[PDB]
């Protein structure tokens, strides 16, 4: 029960800290940063769907295994999770312009396993044990603000990935300078949105599992945004010098 939960959290935190350090130097080898020599590859679209599926599925499974699956605040938190992950699993990958037709299996296995552990941990902290997400929490500003940051970051992430989709007609592999929306300010507003999103999750849940996931998302996307930003500035002599990588007007 709680033994596995604490060990899952320790391992996720450890993995996030070590990922942060390494990703400042070597970006995760998918997308524009996919090189040779990363082992066997798999179809890119199937990898995205298969690797993300544990997050909505294992979360719902463990959620329902908790006594408090019938409580209002847990059910609102389930709504936020599934809003994200039904989009991440069954909208984003189906519409994406895939570029390279294959992607490294090792990266997709990491994501699959991460989502298994992270999905279970986050649901476990909500509906199991004592009810901490009472109706009093619904009247706590931390839940309200957290939920609004969740939805704001989610919305920005969705809007940002949609703009990217149209930079490629289906079947194309080209990269274009993204423009409009928040690209007016940062190279990776999709990453900005998702970072803010899971910070909002951490606030609304007030669980160690939510906090570790907000930390892990930052640990992973913040160095990736810097690598994307560096990539843009060397691929395009054209690229706006005023843009930051992730944080408007900062980095
Ligand atoms: N929570 C987390 O820790 C993580 C979650 N995510 C989320 O999942 C989503 C996918 O992330 P990720 O794939 O890294 O996002 P990217 O922005 O790197 O790529 C998303 C899609 O847009 C395409 N694309 C990106 N830039 C351009 C461009 N300049 N011109 C044309 N097409 C472009 C990519 O094609 P191509 O792949 O060929 O570059 C890909 O299909 C994001 O919303 C992200 O926040 C992903 C990683 C970690
Ligand atoms: C009370 C409500 C509870 C609901 C909780 C679970 C929600 C289930 C639905 C998930 C799909 C959401 C997807 C949001 C729309 C996707 C936006 C998008 O990507 O569209 C791009 C456009 O079609 C071209 O670029
Ligand atoms: C050199 C690498 C340093 C090691 C540390 C980095 C590990 C990569 C992140 C794993 C967590 C995944 C959790 C969130 C899912 C992200 C989706 C993804 O990872 O990309 C998949 C790929 O595009 C299609 O298979
Ligand atoms: C997909 C699911 C999306 C979920 C989106 C969640 C957004 C929550 C935002 C604000 C919370 C509302 C505050 C709740 C107000 C309760 C106040 C109260 O306790 O009632 C008044 C009392 O009767 C007088 O004494
Ligand atoms: C209950 C909620 C009801 C709505 C649930 C899902 C809507 C799915 C939204 C996605 C609609 C697909 C639109 C499309 O096909 O656009 C592809 C385009 O190539 C990309 O730019
Ligand atoms: C849900 C509200 C935000 C969804 C953003 C979105 O999917 O639409 C962006 C549009 O396709 C690009 O202009
Ligand atoms: C870009 C703007 C980002 C948005 C800015 C907001 C940042 C908030 C970050 C995390 C929420 C903090 C909550 C983390 C603490 C959760 C764990 C906890 O404290 O409760 C466990 C309890 O003590 C049983 O031991």
TrEMBL record:
Residues binding NADPH, per UniProt: 30, 32, 157, 161, 168, 175-176, 190-191, 194, 217, 224, 228, 232
Keyword Nucleotide-binding recorded: yes
Keyword Phosphoprotein tagged: no
Top-rank taxon, per record: Bacteria
Keywords of the record: Nucleotide-binding
Transmembrane intervals: none
Name of protein: 3-oxo-5-alpha-steroid 4-dehydrogenase
Species this protein is from: Pseudomonadota bacterium
Lineage: Bacteria, Pseudomonadati, Pseudomonadota
